[PDB]
Point group: D2
Chain length 120, copies 4
């Protein structure tokens, strides 16, 4: 209900997610940036029984950057929380890992942050 | 074949995963540490068509820290790569996000690293 | 000139810095949040000869959370870049490490992000 | 006494540091890897009054990747803890930020981990 829907980051990337009663996140991620083109499968987990003291709902998901058209040989994971209300928000930090040789493995993992809203 | 199996981190946590032909990771995570007890659902993605130049296979997965017995109101995401061979390895960095109030949201996200092997 | 001055994060924390000709950052950090009170020493480094292609100036600094009044037994490091102009900005990610036992060392390091401006 | 000395990471990089009575870290970093050559200035902070319950000493430092010979237009920060004894150790996580355009700013920050020992 809260987490199910279409979400938009600050850089124009679309996250279309379903929050299953079990705790499953399934969907598609469309990335406006990077070595990516078009639509990618998303899987993840959320807290299906969150705290009743105004705290956010912990969640996370993974996109492997491989569809029928492109393969970036990389995966992003987002770790975050859903903050429900009028101005509904998913505040995340992410890790992007690239497939490297053991000599390049030190420089394999980019870190960042994304804020997602339900407003295009 | 490579990624499918039972994996062990440096702190004694068990990761039992199946790597589906589509790019799906499904399994269970048993955590030896933290505010956790017993067995938790794992979902993730991997690069189902990796590079043929000695590079690792990018992957990622999520555990929401909620089963039938416990709820820690938190989720970990691991971002990493599978390095195949005799001494097969998953080198990861992780983000653990806790469900917080907006006043506590600065301190919501722990970062770390795990190395997983197929040797108990 | 650019980096020298008083800076304000999104959570109301004051960063007063001098950018030395050698590449030295020296100053004080006043933290509006956490287990902190009042004014703490800052040391860091910046790129004293940045690129002339509209790119930001790489920098970083450390605060150990210990003055004459408090000791939180912790240190934050910020890694970022100075973006000069009319709306001058320091975009950072940070690591906060706490002094722990080896059993608690997995949960020692919080990660986040701060944006600093010259507007109070 | 504990933190003052020559330190070696897992990838063969030398950290030569002095731990001042005030809490100041000063030194040189010699990087065995990356777009770097030779010797770079290090500044940082440590907890000069740590806890007497077997807990590590929180510290941090910054290297801007610029000397008289090279400029990588980047800075690394390490956040960590000193674990004293027979097998003395500095366990860190790091952020490497590169000077980028605002279009490339999402991919500006690499994350990793280093363990330093006093054994070459
Ligand atoms: O460049 C790549 O290796 C593949 C595309 C990565 C897209 C990045 S992942 C973090 C951030 N979130 C997005 O909306 N896309 C970028
Ligand atoms: O303490 C909690 O909030 C829930 C348990 C967290 C387990 C952590 S997640 C990162 C690391 N990997 C493990 O094997 N377990 C710990
Ligand atoms: O709570 C502590 O352990 C000490 C105070 C930490 C202050 C944090 S560090 C990251 C963020 N930046 C700030 O302005 N202060 C908080
Ligand atoms: O490649 C660059 O941009 C400059 C050199 C970076 C060296 C990296 S920083 C993290 C790690 N620690 C080291 O010993 N060196 C590498």
């Amino acid at each position: 209900a809260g987490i199910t829907g279409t979400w938009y980051n600050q850089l124009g990337s679309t996250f279309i997610v379903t929050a299953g009663a079990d705790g499953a996140l399934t969907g598609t991620y469309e990335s406006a940036v990077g070595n990516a083109e078009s639509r990618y499968v998303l899987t993840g987990r959320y807290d299906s029984a969150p705290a009743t003291d105004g705290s956010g709902t912990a969640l996370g998901w993974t996109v492997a950057w491989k569809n029928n058209y492109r393969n970036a040989h990389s995966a992003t994971t987002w770790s975050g929380q859903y903050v429900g209300g009028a101005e509904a928000r998913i505040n995340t930090q992410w890790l992007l890992t690239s497939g490297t040789t053991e000599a390049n493995a030190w420089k394999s993992t980019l870190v960042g942050h994304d804020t997602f809203t339900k407003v295009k």
